[PDB]
Amino acid sequence: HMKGQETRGFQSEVKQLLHLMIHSLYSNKEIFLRELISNASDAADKLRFRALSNPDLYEGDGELRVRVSFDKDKRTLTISDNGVGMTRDEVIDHLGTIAKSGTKSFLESLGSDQAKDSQLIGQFGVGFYSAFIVADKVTVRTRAAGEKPENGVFWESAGEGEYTVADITKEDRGTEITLHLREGEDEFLDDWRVRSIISKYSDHIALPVEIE
Ligand SMILES: Nc1ncnc2c1ncn2[C@@H]1O[C@H](COP(=O)(O)OP(=O)(O)O)[C@@H](O)[C@H]1O
Ligand SMILES: [Mg+2]
């Protein structure tokens, strides 16, 4: 049910950093939940700012939140928001490149001293690609506020050297991120553990989180 399927390569620096991050941040692997929930919260803020000049962007779905769900059989964790969403060009510009400034130096500054690592991670957002610390496949389904449902976007990657993008019909506004968990990462199928991790981060993040 996809149209315009295209494979694109990660930029070289991005590819190398992704690979380094999976190792260097493993002792703080739960940080991906901070990163994805933070992104949902920003997406909600963006929707609200845009909606100032166009109330219809709420689409009658005004209660903004992020929903977390689990599939034990498929070994997936899904983080889904009804924030601003992304167009195809936004997906390519933001999830394609995504060479976050300072990331290289940040990762190189991590090491065996867990106290220094915790201090660093507390001060720097690694972003979306943190998902690959715990997941061997990440799939995004998104549809931007005000856009026709037929102009949704699919994005998928194994976090190696490429991703695939396509057009999809997505009736609901926002971004749904599905993580297929790596072997050994069943921690993130435990609703209590995930709720607990998120609650600690939710002290600084301003968007309601619903754990299914
Ligand atoms: N849930 C989402 N909804 C809308 N846009 C998103 C979402 N997640 C990520 N993005 C987009 O991808 C970009 C990159 O995210 P990220 O790697 O976390 O870096 P940052 O949050 O610092 O910009 C964001 O700036 C945003 O434009
Ligand atoms: Mg972010």
Nearest-angstrom CA–CA distance, 3 and 19: 30
Query: What lines the ligand 1 site, CB under 6 Å?
Result: 35, 39-40, 42-43, 81, 83-86, 94-95, 98, 100, 125, 127-128, 175
DSSP category for residue 195: H
Q: Which residues are annotated as a binding site for ATP?
A: 39, 81, 128, 175
**Protein residue with its CA nearest to atom 7 in ligand 1:** 39
**Phi, psi dihedral angles at 64 (to 5 degrees):** -85, 135
Nearest-angstrom CA–CA distance, 148 and 156: 21
**Phi, psi dihedral angles at 207 (to 5 degrees):** -160, 130
Report the SS3 class of residue 202.
Answer: coil
Tokens of 77: 């964790």
Report which bound ligand comes closest to the CA of 95: 1
**Protein residue with its CA nearest to atom 24 in ligand 1:** 94
**Protein residue with its CA nearest to atom 1 in ligand 1:** 40
As a whole number of Å, the CA-based R_g of the chain is 17
Q: Specify the experimental method.
A: X-ray
User: Domain residues of the chain, as ranges?
Assistant: 1-212
What is each CA distance from 113 to 23, 43, 71, 203, in whole angstroms? 15, 34, 35, 26
Nearest-angstrom CA–CA distance, 79 and 175: 8
CB 93 within 8 A of CB 128: no
Nearest-angstrom CA–CA distance, 80 and 61: 14
Q: In sequence order, what DSSP letters do the residues of 55-117 get, joined into one string?
A: GGGGTT-----EEEEEETTTTEEEEEE-SS---HHHHIIIIII---TTHHHHHHH--S-HHHH
Query: CB within 8 A of 14, min separation 6: which ones?
Result: 97, 98, 99, 129
Which ligand 1 atom sits closest to the C-alpha of 177? 1
Nearest-angstrom CA–CA distance, 207 and 212: 16
CA of 3 relative to ligand 2 center, distance in Å = 28
Interior CA angle at 120 toward 106 and 95, to 5°? 50
Nearest-angstrom CA–CA distance, 24 and 105: 12
Identity of the residue numbered 191:
D
Nearest-angstrom CA–CA distance, 186 and 30: 12
* The domain made up of 1-212 is a member of CATH 3.40.50.300: no
